[PDB]
Design a protein around this ligand. Structure first.
Ligand SMILES: [Zn+2]
Length: 187
């Protein structure tokens, strides 16, 4: 994949206005697949911008209203129109999940330099996302090799048929395109 100034190339730079710090240490290389929307990169929905400005009202549900108090920071957010946004480079650890576990490894927090996908009410995801994500993932695997067999989300803690409250990211398409437990070297 292209890299420019040691930053991820062909992406929109949106470095989060307040990063996190979590007291955990596991090698950062986990791919997180789920449809979320939290940061106001580009949209016209006032709820997302209200979070960052701070005027969010405890109406939607408790989790979102709760976590508002804590700043958020993702890593690479791919929007539903096949766009790549980058919030928080490989320098100064982020937080965007709560908890997740895969292959007898639980991550207490989203303490890994993965990806996150963004959409709004399952608005057309543009298959292009999967293709471009797979390209980024090829680079990321070649950087830190884990992701090649470590793809999960927040509901994929055990059953891969669910990945969040809205998967539909075609596990057969993605797993075939990405490293299929072959076309790898070293480990
Ligand atoms: Zn999630």
């Amino acid at each position: 994949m292209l890299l420019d100034e040691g930053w991820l190339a062909e992406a929109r730079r949106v470095p989060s206005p307040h990063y996190d710090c979590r007291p955990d240490d596991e090698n950062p290389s986990l791919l997180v697949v789920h449809n979320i929307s939290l940061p106001p990169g580009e949209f016209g929905g006032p709820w997302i911008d209200a979070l960052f400005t701070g005027t969010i009202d405890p109406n939607a549900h408790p989790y979102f209203a709760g976590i508002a108090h804590l700043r958020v920071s993702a890593h690479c957010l791919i929007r539903r129109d096949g766009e790549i946004v980058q919030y928080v480079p490989f320098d100064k650890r982020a937080w965007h999940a709560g908890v997740s576990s895969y292959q007898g490894r639980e991550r207490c927090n989203d303490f890994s330099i993965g990806i996150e996908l963004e959409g709004t009410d399952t608005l057309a995801y543009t298959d292009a996302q999967y293709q471009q994500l797979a390209a980024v993932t090829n680079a990321l695997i070649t950087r830190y090799p884990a992701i090649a067999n470590n793809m999960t989300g927040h509901c994929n803690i055990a059953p891969e048929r669910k990945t969040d409250p809205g998967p539909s990211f075609d596990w057969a398409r993605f797993r075939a395109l990405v490293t299929p437990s072959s076309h790898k070297e070293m480990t």
